[PDB]
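#dry-run=false #mode=assembly
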Amino acid sequence: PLGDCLRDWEDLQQDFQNIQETHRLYRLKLEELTKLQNNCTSSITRQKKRLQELALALKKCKAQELENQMKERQGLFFDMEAYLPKKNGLYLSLVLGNVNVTLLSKQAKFAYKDEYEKFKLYLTIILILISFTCRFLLNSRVTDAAFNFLLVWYYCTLTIRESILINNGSRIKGWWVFHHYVSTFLSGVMLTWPDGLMYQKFRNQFLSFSMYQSFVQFLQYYYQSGCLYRLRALGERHVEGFQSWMWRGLTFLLPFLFFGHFWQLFNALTLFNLAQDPQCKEWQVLMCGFPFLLLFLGNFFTTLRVVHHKFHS
Amino acid sequence: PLGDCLRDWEDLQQDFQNIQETHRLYRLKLEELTKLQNNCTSSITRQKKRLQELALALKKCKAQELENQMKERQGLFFDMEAYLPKKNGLYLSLVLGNVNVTLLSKQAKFAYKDEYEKFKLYLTIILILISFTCRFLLNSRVTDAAFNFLLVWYYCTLTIRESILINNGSRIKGWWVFHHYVSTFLSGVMLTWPDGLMYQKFRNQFLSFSMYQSFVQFLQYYYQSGCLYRLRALGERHVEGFQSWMWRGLTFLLPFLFFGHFWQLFNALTLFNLAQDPQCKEWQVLMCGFPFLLLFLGNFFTTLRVVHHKFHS
Ligand SMILES: CC(C)(COP(=O)(O)OP(=O)(O)OC[C@H]1O[C@@H](n2cnc3c(N)ncnc32)[C@H](O)[C@@H]1OP(=O)(O)O)[C@@H](O)C(=O)NCCC(=O)NCCS
Ligand SMILES: CC(C)(COP(=O)(O)OP(=O)(O)OC[C@H]1O[C@@H](n2cnc3c(N)ncnc32)[C@H](O)[C@@H]1OP(=O)(O)O)[C@@H](O)C(=O)NCCC(=O)NCCS
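#status=ok
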């Protein structure tokens, strides 16, 4: 009754005094860690600045041991700065604002990467079903617009997640983010395409390409998740045992990627041919052929570059 | 030369030993603060759970002093939990992922709110210029699609920023985020609208409404930034001196908002009337009239609710 409520409230008040002391100490160590953290970041930035000044002096001065020690120094400074907050890029400051997406611990980085891979897998599952209903079951304009809008949203959120990953350590190559922007522009151009003969002569091929891109993204998720888990296992306790599986997966994955690149080039050439028809009143065909060509060129060059990098090392 | 480089490298190595010790201590206090922070969050959650259990017991038990102390307790617990990380919502976990957007210090919250207001102001400036070129200068379909796409992007990023603000303390009412989703859906529906007589009979009115909404957003930014700066000044050292200006700004701002609500209702009624024409082959008019009606209803009810709340207190 009232006595039980009063006794429970007294116990809650004693626990409240304890938790208020705990929170005051928490705020104290939070301010102390913020001050020390800003000091550490400023000192690493000035250390890197003076090291780069010495580097540009020594580059025009000419020994090799100094170069090796400086390269090791720069690599470990990159790791240390990745452990610290790295502020935000241009796109992250534009969209997300002046907020810190840090994920300071390495386990947090792994969890974010795994959740990003699973997010890509689930949106791949959803996109392949919607592309299947658009290409085969239903020939409507409402569902194609819905598919293109979900493609735009998926690529924009993937750009946001990849910028977050870049902000903390991850070596996402700069082409893939621009790939996401160009694919967003492509789906936006396809959204504004009015219904007609030119749209119907390309819609089935575009939806089949989207279906194949999602199917390739399935295997990409499998390879990337396996590689991430193998790096996590090999990192702590559990080199040659990982590379073999990594190269087997890369060799199994490369022909599908190259067929996707050639399909992108084929879509670009098909849109370029369709833009020359007498029954071509839409500017969307010519302004949509260019993103497929750009995607083919950039993706093919980047894939060949990373394959050459993997073979070299 | 080589001797100068060696001496500079030795000095950099001594500073490196210092900064490596500093970083090791930083990692130590980071792990300690993370452990204490998780302990504090768990203890606040269990304290709030037991307090709510006692609250639901005492509500059906019936004293008033207990209710007043419990209300003060819940308010200060909300402030304490807002100082701590509050995880992520459904939308933030969907888009941003499992990353912490915290802004732990109150100054960080103020800086993020001010940057959000300035972002809204700059996008308002850009949107009013593009809407001016679309409504008056150029009657093209490319520029209207660009305006609608920028509207979609602006509303999506505004949804992201508002979810971030909700995640740390800010009392953004839940209607405004859904306002942003419904406006995104409206602009997406307008994107898929094919060119025709029905589109041309509504395009000028919609662009004029967008121009007026941006003009109202200018005054909204002015009022919100002034209110935020007045709360910041009055909060530290520098009640009646703020309320008077706040109510003057609210009284100057309310007729513009109500005219915007009536314009939203007028656009809904105009689209409902246009959907009944014999020359109406587009479903976009009927599926676009509904978001204007929903926006009018929700925005008008929410504005009247917050005005009644401000007048009551
Ligand atoms: C080689 C490839 C298959 C992956 O190999 P890889 O192990 O990731 O090698 P990388 O050098 O690129 O790895 C660097 C980082 O970039 C990331 N990354 C690689 N490819 C990426 C992509 N397409 N998107 C986002 N991130 C990517 C990796 O996860 C990796 O993460 P990390 O920081 O922990 O190291 C890569 O080229 C790829 O993913 N290509 C996809 C191209 C494509 O899909 N084209 C369309 C076909 S229709
Ligand atoms: C009354 C009004 C004008 C602002 O008054 P207010 O001082 O912000 O009062 P609130 O109760 O809403 O403030 C609570 C919080 O919500 C925020 N907020 C208020 N209106 C908001 C909005 N439209 N969008 C995002 N956030 C908003 C405030 O910044 C405030 O921040 P806080 O956490 O620091 O306290 C508000 O109703 C409003 O902004 N309406 C806009 C409606 C509109 O634009 N319709 C379209 C016209 S065409």
